[PDB]
Amino acid sequence: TSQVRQNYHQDSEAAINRQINLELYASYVYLSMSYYFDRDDVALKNFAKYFLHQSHEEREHAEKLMKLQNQRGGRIFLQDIQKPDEDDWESGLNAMEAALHLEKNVNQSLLELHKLATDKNDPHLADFIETHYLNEQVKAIKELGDHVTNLRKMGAPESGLAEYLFDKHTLG
């Protein structure tokens, strides 16, 4: 056992490894979305920038969980990063809806992790998840919902003018 390990359950260690993979997966989904908007036949530069920023932030989220694993004396076991479920994200609205779904899935996983930490009487882990992950997820979900609403109200996806103007005025 690691000399630093204290009050850190095997199940929590495993759940953190799973969460690392999920954050890396989210980073990869956002990378895919970004470059879809960089296609010459899509050509929404601020959608591309928005999703690239999200991709880089998800990598930061994963790295912080890797740091946590080592802080607690767990051992990192990486797994493959699955490719995303689409190659073509169809539209700005559709990508935002897929991102909303992704973020809710990530949130669900984090909530299960918090419950595990609580069940194993690991208050350090529970508060790590609260403090660094749970409000970030609520903010991310709220932002994506706001974006979806605006795009729908403006007439996306059928209105390419709507997506163009949203790209300029919200994402610019």
User: Is 101 labelled as part of a ligand binding site?
Assistant: no
On whether 58 is known to bind a ligand per the annotation, the reply is yes
The helix (run of H) or strand (run of E) holding residue 15 is helix 10-37
Residue type, 71: Q
- Return all residues near 136 (Cβ < 8 A) that are at least 6 apart: 61
Query: Which residues inside 25-54 make contact with a copy of itself, applying CB under 8 A?
Result: 28, 31-32, 35-36, 38-43, 45, 52
Q: Which is nearer to a copy of itself, 11 or 123 (CB)?
A: 123
When asked if residue 57 is in the footprint of a copy of itself (CB under 8 A), the reply is no
Shortest CB 161 distance to Ca ion, Å: 27
* Shortest separation between residue 2's beta carbon and Ca ion, angstroms: 9
Rg (CA), the chain: 18
Structure tokens at 167: 């790209």
Shortest Å distance, C-beta 101 to a copy of itself:
10
The string of DSSP letters for 98-112 reads HHHHHHHHHHHHHHH
- Binding-site annotation: residue ranges: 23, 58, 61, 103, 137
- Binding-site annotation: residue ranges for Fe cation: 23, 58, 61, 103, 137
